[PDB]
Design a protein around this ligand. Structure first.
Ligand code: ATP
Ligand code: GDP
Ligand code: MG
Ligand code: MG
Ligand code: MG
Lengths: 51, 10, 101, 132, 205, 80, 352
């Protein structure tokens, strides 16, 4: 639902701002989320829960 | 009771 | 010296989950996309299922750190309702008071 | 421009209003820049705006520009009623101000929502007393 | 209540205030100098000084309100008054110059008279004597008579016997019927009185 | 494209295309053969019509802008 | 009769008649206004046993333009706009009455919002498989169009051959009434019959056969959004409707011999906020571009003179029954609550 100008201007902003550049579905974007944060088991509240 | 209106009796 | 055997099992589950977190994160990434071949994702499914059961973080239970109560725990202080109240009601929790309004 | 006006404030529930009542005017009321009948499409909310001016026989004699935030449509009309009445007291005689007070037009309504209590369904309603 | 007992109810009546001082009695002069020292409750959003204000219709509107929906209850009321007026203008234009004089076209006059024709003078209340409850035919206070005329009218229109008829058409039809001493609500008044006459011998309980 | 632009431009727009088409039909009705584009779009009336449409498109619409647009259309269409 | 005028000819109304109510004969209500009158105004005609329309500066401004219309120039678009309930529809109807009494052919769309919502039978078209027909919406209008223009539907004759089916066809030179009767009798052909009518009138008005008035209330409907759905529950666009595609053509100034008078309405619109009334806010970008250049005529609330004459018209019909309504204090409350808005005043007076 975007014009060629808008589609290529958004792909240019993604390149500059370090976003995903290839067309990626919602399922595959979980890979980005998985590596953008620490796993729950690696959070200090989790492994240092108990004294 | 006397003043009251009991309607058309039948 | 932990409160009970159930707290001791959770301690081990938290230690093993920490050791396998990176390995599990990497394998899950292979399973959580539509880009790689199914033949490769089917193998990754078997690999993460073959890891030790206590490496799975869903088995970690947030128990009271002083009494090992598995429910009624307040995450911020990691204490059960009973233990939290004991400390709160004696003025030993900074800034916490009874709420009236 | 040298036009005399008074300013006051009113509160109803969570609604807070600030009204500017001009000494002279034609009866125009602006609510957040909107005509009062466009801002208040409900006839009861407009009757509340009429109540202060009508009570002192000054419909069509003052211009008002008010701002209101918070609360619902009825609470906003109530807050504006109080703000306009307080400001309107500057342009009426002392005896008229005492009549507005005795009519309930200058008193902030203290009736606000009551908190829910734990162990009961509502602020007053209790849970069903289980069949014995 | 969030009002302390010191708060007095507001008196919303323009005439009461414009009344000259000379006409006032020594008792009425004291009440006026007293209120200047008293706390007054905020005027409710329901009632205003408007010349078109009718406390009876405002009360009937609240008894029709479901779940705090005053906008809808008010809309139904004004639609009923418009429906009553249009039914009378149609009866008026279709009538002869002689009949036209007897045709009322004011919906407020019809509304008030319709309810007054339904107010029950006497009611049945269980007074206890001897360990048993006997429905004694007891006089009804003025408040109760007016309330019962409204509850009976609203109840009749909510009856499921009416199929797909909107409330402004049902209520307008019942008001004009009761305005002419006809209808189900008028029958409920008559039957209540007739039952109270059959239990006259039970007035000792 | 026009949808991508964030500022309205009257030149080569539907307005310029519609008004010019209207003025030509009017000239034909008068049986006048002065159908030069540069002459029709160079009058002062077109400059007010252009200035009014641009205001409606790039600024907040209001009763004063709608009235300025109205008076410009009445002169171009010879509606008095 | 301080609120009435004896001049019932809309051709002679002027600034001296502003605020006064003129009477529309019952004969003109049946012929000229089988549709288009506001539903509440229709209720007033039945209750008062007469139709009376106030003469206001919007209609007078517009009637001045129509009387000076140059029928050689392309048709001019006039757009009535204003806040809700200000009288846009009844200003249009005052203009339709003027043209109806001048022997103009009237193309009156009483509400264009009804063609973009709540369509039970949205059939696919046969003339074009990419468009949808609306037999009930089209047949209804055709019946009203026939009533308004029945005296002109025999003189006007088609200039082409139109094929309804293999067996049935309308040959050249047949009266236009034959096209209007095929659509009424056969609702499956109603939507195409409308398209033929609009095609013939636009064509034959530019030749000098007659003067044509195009009156569309709710014009903003044509270039907005619809609530009609396809069998796959996908949204349909207004251009895909045959009724809307063809009405959009009557709104172009590519013909001469008449005028195009339209009115905006937020009431009954789709996907527009309550307080939207200005042309661009209601027409959108596609709509404003389709009508530009157009002449917008503002309709506002009753001025002090109009408000008093309106109250007098109700008091002269005994419509205000509350004993306090005729008083000066009663009229000031009726002025504050309505704020002079004609619709709010009519609704408030309806139950008083
Ligand atoms: N010229 C008039 N003469 C008589 N009554 C009028 C006139 N203009 C408005 N009214 C009154 O106001 C009511 C609303 O008018 P109308 O429906 O024409 O307004 P509108 O602006 O087209 O409304 P909407 O915004 O809903 O389309 C009418 O039903 C009538 O009671
Ligand atoms: N049934 C039928 N309808 C026709 C015929 N010719 C035209 N129409 C209708 O008249 C409308 C207007 O005609 P035209 O300008 O040719 O339409 P266009 O081809 O869609 O631009 C069409 O959209 C059709 O609905 C015909 O021969 N038969
Ligand atoms: Mg768990
Ligand atoms: Mg509750
Ligand atoms: Mg309208």
């Amino acid at each position: 639902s975007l014009s060629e100008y808008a589609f290529r201007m958004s792909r240019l902003s993604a390149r500059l701002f370090g976003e995903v550049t290839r067309p990626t579905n919602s399922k595959s974007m979980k890979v980005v989320k998985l590596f953008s944060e620490l796993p729950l088991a690696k959070k200090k509240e989790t492994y240092d829960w108990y004294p | 009771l006397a003043v009251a209106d009991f309607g058309p009796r039948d | 010296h932990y409160v009970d055997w159930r707290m001791w099992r959770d301690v081990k589950r938290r230690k093993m989950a920490y050791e396998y977190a990176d390995e599990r994160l990497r394998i899950n990434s292979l399973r959580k996309n539509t880009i790689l071949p199914k033949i490769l994702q089917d193998v990754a499914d078997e690999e993460i299922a073959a890891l030790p059961r206590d490496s799975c973080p869903v088995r970690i239970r947030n128990r009271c750190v002083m009494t090992s109560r598995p429910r009624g725990v307040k995450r911020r202080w990691r204490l059960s309702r009973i233990v939290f109240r004991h400390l709160a009601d004696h003025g030993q929790l900074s800034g916490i008071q009874r709420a009236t309004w | 421009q040298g036009m005399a006006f008074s300013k006051s404030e009113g509160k109803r529930k969570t609604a807070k209003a600030e009204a500017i009542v001009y000494k002279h005017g034609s009866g125009r009321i602006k609510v957040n820049g909107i005509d009062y009948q466009l801002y208040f499409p409900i006839t009861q909310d407009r009757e509340q705006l009429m109540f202060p001016f009508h009570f002192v026989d000054r419909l069509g004699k003052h211009d008002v520009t008010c701002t209101v935030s918070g609360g619902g449509r009825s609470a906003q009309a109530g807050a504006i009623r109080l703000a306009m009445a307080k400001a309107l007291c500057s342009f009426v005689t002392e005896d008229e101000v005492e009549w507005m007070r005795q009519a309930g037009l200058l008193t902030t309504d203290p009736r606000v929502r009551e908190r829910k209590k734990p162990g009961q369904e509502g602020a007053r309603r209790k849970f069903t007393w289980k069949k014995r | 209540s969030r009002y302390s007992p010191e708060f007095k109810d507001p008196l919303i009546d323009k005439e009461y205030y414009r009344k000259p001082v000379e006409e006032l009695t020594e008792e009425e002069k004291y009440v006026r100098e007293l209120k200047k020292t008293q706390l007054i409750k905020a005027a409710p959003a329901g009632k205003t000084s408007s010349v078109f204000e009718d406390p009876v219709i405002s009360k009937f509107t609240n008894m029709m309100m479901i779940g705090g929906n005053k906008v809808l209850a008010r809309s139904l009321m004004i639609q009923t008054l418009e429906a009553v007026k249009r039914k009378q203008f149609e009866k008026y234009h279709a009538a002869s110059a002689e009949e036209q004089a007897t045709i009322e076209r004011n919906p407020y006059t019809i509304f008030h008279q319709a309810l007054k024709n339904c107010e029950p003078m006497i009611g049945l209340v269980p007074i206890l004597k001897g360990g048993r409850f006997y429905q004694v035919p007891v006089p009804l206070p003025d408040r109760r008579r007016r309330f019962l005329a409204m509850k009976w009218m609203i109840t009749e229109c909510r009856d499921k016997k009416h199929q797909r008829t909107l409330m402004p058409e049902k209520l307008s039809h019942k008001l004009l019927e009761a305005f002419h001493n006809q209808g189900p609500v008028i029958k409920r008044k008559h039957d209540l009185h007739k039952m109270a006459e059959a239990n006259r011998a039970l007035a000792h309980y | 494209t026009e949808a991508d632009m964030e500022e309205y431009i009257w030149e080569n727009s539907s307005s310029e295309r519609n008004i010019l088409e209207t003025l030509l039909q009017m000239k034909a009705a008068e049986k006048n053969m002065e159908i030069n584009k540069e002459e029709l779009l160079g009058t002062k009336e077109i400059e007010e019509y252009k200035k009014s449409v641009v205001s409606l498109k790039n600024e907040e619409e209001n009763e004063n802008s709608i009235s300025q647009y109205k008076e410009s259309v009445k002169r171009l269409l010879n509606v008095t | 009769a301080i609120s009435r005028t004896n001049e019932n000819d809309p051709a002679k109304h002027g600034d001296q008649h502003e605020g006064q109510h003129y009477n529309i004969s019952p004969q003109d209500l049946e012929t000229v206004f089988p549709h288009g009158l506001p539903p509440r105004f229709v209720m007033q005609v039945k209750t008062f046993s007469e139709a009376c329309l106030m003469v206001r500066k919007p209609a007078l401004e517009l009637l001045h333009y129509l009387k000076n219309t140059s029928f050689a120039y392309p048709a001019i678009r006039y757009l009535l706009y204003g806040e809700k309930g200000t009288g846009k529809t009844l200003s249009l109807c005052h203009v339709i009455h003027f043209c109806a009494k001048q022997d103009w052919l009237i193309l009156h769309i009483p509400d264009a919002h009804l063609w973009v919502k709540n369509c039970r039978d949205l059939l696919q078209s046969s003339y074009n498989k990419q468009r949808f027909d609306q037999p009930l919406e089209a047949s209804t209008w055709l019946k009203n169009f026939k009533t308004t223009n029945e005296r002109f539907l025999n003189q006007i004759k088609v200039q082409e051959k139109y094929v309804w089916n293999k067996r049935e066809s309308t040959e050249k030179g047949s009266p236009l009434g034959e096209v209007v009767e095929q659509g009424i009798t056969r609702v499956r052909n109603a939507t195409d019959a409308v398209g033929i009518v609009l095609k013939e009138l636009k064509r034959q008005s530019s030749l000098g056969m007659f003067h044509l008035l195009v009156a569309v209330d709710g014009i903003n409907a044509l270039w907005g959004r619809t609530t009609l759905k396809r069998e796959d529950k996908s949204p349909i666009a207004p251009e895909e409707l045959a009724l809307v595609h063809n009405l959009r053509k009557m709104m172009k100034n590519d013909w001469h011999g008449g005028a195009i008078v339209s009115a905006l309405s937020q009431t009954g619109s789709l996907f527009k906020p309550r307080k939207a009334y200005l042309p661009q806010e209601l027409l959108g970008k596609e709509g404003f571009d389709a009508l530009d250049p157009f002449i917008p005529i503002l309709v506002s609330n009753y001025n002090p003179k109009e408000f008093e004459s309106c109250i007098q018209y109700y008091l002269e019909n005994n419509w205000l029954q509350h004993e306090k309504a005729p008083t000066e204090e009663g009229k000031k409350e009726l002025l504050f609550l309505s704020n002079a808005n004609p619709s709010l005043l009519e609704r408030h007076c309806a139950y008083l």
